[PDB]
Amino acid sequence: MLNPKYTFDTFVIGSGNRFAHAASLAVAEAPAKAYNPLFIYGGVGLGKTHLMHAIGHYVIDHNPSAKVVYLSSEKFTNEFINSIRDNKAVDFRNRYRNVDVLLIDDIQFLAGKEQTQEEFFHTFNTLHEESKQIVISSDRPPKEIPTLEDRLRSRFEWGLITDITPPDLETRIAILRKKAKAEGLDIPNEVMLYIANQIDSNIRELEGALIRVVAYSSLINKDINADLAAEALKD
Amino acid sequence: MLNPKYTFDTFVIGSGNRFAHAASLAVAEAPAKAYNPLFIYGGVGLGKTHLMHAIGHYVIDHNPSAKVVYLSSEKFTNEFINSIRDNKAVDFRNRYRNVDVLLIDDIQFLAGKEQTQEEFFHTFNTLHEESKQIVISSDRPPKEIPTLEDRLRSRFEWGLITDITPPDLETRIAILRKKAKAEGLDIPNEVMLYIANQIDSNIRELEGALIRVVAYSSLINKDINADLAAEALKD
Amino acid sequence: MLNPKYTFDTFVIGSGNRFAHAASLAVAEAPAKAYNPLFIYGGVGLGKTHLMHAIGHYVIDHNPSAKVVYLSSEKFTNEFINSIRDNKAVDFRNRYRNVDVLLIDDIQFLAGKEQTQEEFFHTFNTLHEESKQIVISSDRPPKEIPTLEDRLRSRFEWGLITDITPPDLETRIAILRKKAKAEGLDIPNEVMLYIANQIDSNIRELEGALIRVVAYSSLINKDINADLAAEALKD
Amino acid sequence: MLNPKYTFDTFVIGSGNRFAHAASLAVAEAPAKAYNPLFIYGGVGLGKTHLMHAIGHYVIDHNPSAKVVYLSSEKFTNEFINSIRDNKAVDFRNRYRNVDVLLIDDIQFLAGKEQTQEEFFHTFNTLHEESKQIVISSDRPPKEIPTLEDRLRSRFEWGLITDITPPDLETRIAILRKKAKAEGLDIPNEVMLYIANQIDSNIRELEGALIRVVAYSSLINKDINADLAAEALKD
Amino acid sequence: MLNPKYTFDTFVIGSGNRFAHAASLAVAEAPAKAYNPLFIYGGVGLGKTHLMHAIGHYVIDHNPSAKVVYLSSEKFTNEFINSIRDNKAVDFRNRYRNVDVLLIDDIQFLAGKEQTQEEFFHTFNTLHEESKQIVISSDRPPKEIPTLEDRLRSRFEWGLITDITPPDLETRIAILRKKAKAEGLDIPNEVMLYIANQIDSNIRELEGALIRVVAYSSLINKDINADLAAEALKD
């Protein structure tokens, strides 16, 4: 279930993510003991899911008996709605109310879902009173999620809330050198600089702009440089 | 489900398609470990579908367990809309969210299909965060697909993007020669030159010209030469 | 569904239709495995529809388990538009995308019909990719059909195109002789020769001129000869 | 729907209309199995409509399940254009394309109605390939109808064409006697002979002459002879 | 709608209007069953319009269910041209093709209106084929109306034509008597005989003379005598 590229070690710290990283490690090192719940929000492609998976690995790599479960809220909704239609709701509860860490991603996808919101509420309360770790990610802070009840907003606000903001030029370059290290790549700093300057959006667009430049250098079998990089990225 | 005619074998490589060929061979050699997702775009009849079936053919033969699925985005839409009407959404999701390689063709037909775009978003995230191969083809790069949410455009720009451009005279001649050898046809080079020189459009029109010339030869029982070829293609 | 008077047995082969007839029979004997698609074009009354029924009969008679559908693009347009109004698009698609042989007459009636063009595109792609025979006819070649997208034009050009031209004096007579033979009639050669010489337009006008000669004869109850003929066809 | 005065029995056969009569009777006796289509043309007031209603009477009397529709091409035009404005085109098609016999009068009023012509085209084709009788009347041969496409002219010439030419004096007398007999009148021969001699135009003008002679007789309470006829028709 | 003073009860029969009167009553007693159409022609101020209104009143009085419409051809022309501009021709056809009796006055004003002619043709055929009464008035017989097509003039001649000729002295006297009885005046036969002798033209001028003579008498305050009449009309 846990993408194995998404560790603390592959996660680059910058000003924009420092809080969320420190909170995520606090929680990993001391599950249910440090911050419960941890609520992480922020814009598209900024590492929410990466951090959530990093908390996961850390906890498992340190307690092989720990029942650790990641899933988007869309998947939590689908399994729940199913258990009602198939009358096996008792089996959905024995699953999700007895995990040791619950990592639930993108809770904004519960908007306009009266029933799944309620079931998430009862799941949240059970896990909290049983000293289990809850980690929720969102694209926006609890106040800005519509159709949400006070009682549920109130529990999202009860632990630590951290935001993630987009990285600067320097941080984008550090994210580029980190993926390049991961595949043994010798790349000039003028290239990274050039790439990071064009792509100031999400680390996916960024990750992708690098994959291209390299793959192209490989096809034409020529050394990587800002002349090549710019050619590979016109389109 | 896969065309036996569309393999890496029957695919002639030229300057217009070298990138997409290499990318597709890499993806095929290393499912999910090389480029994920791979996104291929280009004009009419230049080998996108062929390259996608080529990836399928190779993976199934280097891993007879792998679940490999090819479909147009229009079939993905129809099957999805159906699954909601006949209240079997769980069966649609069991299939598309649990494949090892998804080959999804002509992604632009999700233009202005808000529900299906969202269903494809979650399908994508499930497969990518579980190291499954996504290959996506389009008639255009992600920045140019209308209605396309920016949430997906980004996921399309996150792996490798390759385009294919129309093959030159030399590659068209080589596509003709390759089709002829496969039907066991002995055809003079001057005829392949004649055909390749008149048809500079798409490879579908190029195959059609050869089929016409062969059929008109067979009908008038005369050996294939450049006078016959010009006679058979006048209209 | 199919005209029992429209078979290979009743189709007269001349230089003007040798190519279309040869193609139609190859398709009929080896469906999906000789030429696919087959595109037949030609002016008014030259046996396009006759040849498409003849392929229907041949395939049905030789494989009773084959799903063979003949229809005009006009009926395809109305059945589609209707399936949309009645929320029954899925019933349409289950029919036209699962046949073994699609015989679709007069595709020029899709000029100006963008929604149905897209629907025929998707039907074409599904049938071709699943090794099903497509046969399309037209009053003109693909490049002369207005409003057609390049992706659809290219699909019409990808198999064998065959044109039909107006039959010569020898073939007109052969056609008159064949109609007469079927209708138990007995007619001097000078009569066929006179009719054959006067009607050089379409086989409809030709059949019609034989029908008036026979009818004028039956009326004034005198036996058929050149003088009666010229009297009958005085127009 | 049909005129009870317009039968084969009430129709006076001359040499100018012998051929239309025979063909009409043949059609009536064997619908869809004798002449299909039957195309009748001729000048004003020579019994085209009479002959069409006569076909309709004969078929309905020998087959109560037969669906027989008589209408002018101008009524076909107004019902079509309305069915488009009122979005009920499928309701018009259900009517006209499933009749057993279609009797359409004065086809020349389709001249300059390119949309209606096309709908009639598709109506013709549907009715023809399902073995339904078509009967068309015109004031002129298919060739002489302006704006008519080739594909439609060709279909009008595919069956039996029959002209009707104005009646001779013997037939004009034979007809005046039929109308007089139909009203139980006793009228001297010299009266018919006088009228038939002064009126050589259309049977409408004949009928109106007899009506004037007879109305004048009854007004001035004197018997009908040549002198009174001559006095009544002075203008 | 209609003139309450134009009845059978106020129409003075004489030898000049005998035939037209008989025919108009014959039609009124037996709508669509005695003469269809009825064509009335004749010079100025001879009671054509009066007869047409009298038919109307009689039909309405004996049948409250009956749809009777009187109008000038000029009102028909204008309402029809208006219907085309306003795209409401369907509304024009609904009105005029579904009446039980159509009284259309002064048909000659259709001369030169080729478009209105055709509309009146089709209207005529529809009313006629559905056994509705058509009454047409004119200043001249059909052959003398210009621009009229053969097929329309034919239909004007298919029924009864009645001419009206100017009235004699006895009838002029009787008309004056009847107008004078209507107003409740004691006018000596000497006066009526003076007016009738001097006014031999149309009954409008005849009515005009009486109105002057009466008004002259009212002003001078002198009983009406034949010398008072001579001076009143002196100019």
Ligand SMILES: Nc1ncnc2c1ncn2[C@@H]1O[C@H](COP(=O)(O)OP(=O)(O)NP(=O)(O)O)[C@@H](O)[C@H]1O
């Ligand atoms: N700080 C970081 N260091 C290294 N890689 C990073 C960092 N932030 C993001 N990435 C990479 O960027 C990609 C997107 O990260 P992800 O964890 O999916 O972001 P997200 O905020 O969860 N996106 P979304 O759900 O669309 O709003 C992954 O490949 C991450 O490893």
Ligand SMILES: Nc1ncnc2c1ncn2[C@@H]1O[C@H](COP(=O)(O)OP(=O)(O)NP(=O)(O)O)[C@@H](O)[C@H]1O
């Ligand atoms: N490089 C090539 N060598 C051999 N055959 C080729 C090549 N490129 C395309 N073809 C053939 O061309 C035809 C069309 O290829 P296909 O892969 O369907 O193109 P496409 O890019 O998918 N077209 P479209 O989906 O309309 O934009 C097939 O018969 C292929 O076999």
Ligand SMILES: Nc1ncnc2c1ncn2[C@@H]1O[C@H](COP(=O)(O)OP(=O)(O)NP(=O)(O)O)[C@@H](O)[C@H]1O
């Ligand atoms: N070669 C032929 N031998 C015998 N009959 C023929 C031949 N060609 C045409 N006909 C007859 O001609 C008539 C019209 O043929 P059909 O196949 O309908 O023409 P088409 O090309 O489909 N015309 P159109 O659809 O108007 O563009 C039918 O009765 C056919 O049987």
Ligand SMILES: Nc1ncnc2c1ncn2[C@@H]1O[C@H](COP(=O)(O)OP(=O)(O)NP(=O)(O)O)[C@@H](O)[C@H]1O
């Ligand atoms: N041969 C005939 N014998 C008897 N009555 C006839 C004959 N021909 C025409 N009539 C009568 O003439 C009148 C008009 O004939 P009809 O059948 O309407 O002619 P038409 O050819 O349709 N006229 P049109 O549409 O203006 O060209 C009717 O009253 C018919 O019954």
Ligand SMILES: Nc1ncnc2c1ncn2[C@@H]1O[C@H](COP(=O)(O)OP(=O)(O)NP(=O)(O)O)[C@@H](O)[C@H]1O
């Ligand atoms: N025979 C009649 N008896 C009494 N009044 C009559 C007679 N003929 C005409 N009139 C009167 O004369 C006037 C004109 O009659 P009207 O019916 O309009 O004539 P017309 O033929 O319609 N004229 P026009 O339309 O100019 O060609 C009205 O007041 C009628 O009542």
Ligand SMILES: [K+]
């Ligand atoms: K709740």
Ligand SMILES: [K+]
């Ligand atoms: K949708």
Ligand SMILES: [K+]
């Ligand atoms: K050669």
Ligand SMILES: [K+]
């Ligand atoms: K094939």
Ligand SMILES: [K+]
């Ligand atoms: K359409």
Ligand SMILES: [K+]
């Ligand atoms: K299309």
Ligand SMILES: [K+]
């Ligand atoms: K047409």
Ligand SMILES: [K+]
């Ligand atoms: K005439």
Ligand SMILES: [K+]
């Ligand atoms: K007219």
Ligand SMILES: [Mg+2]
């Ligand atoms: Mg995420």
Ligand SMILES: [Mg+2]
């Ligand atoms: Mg493709």
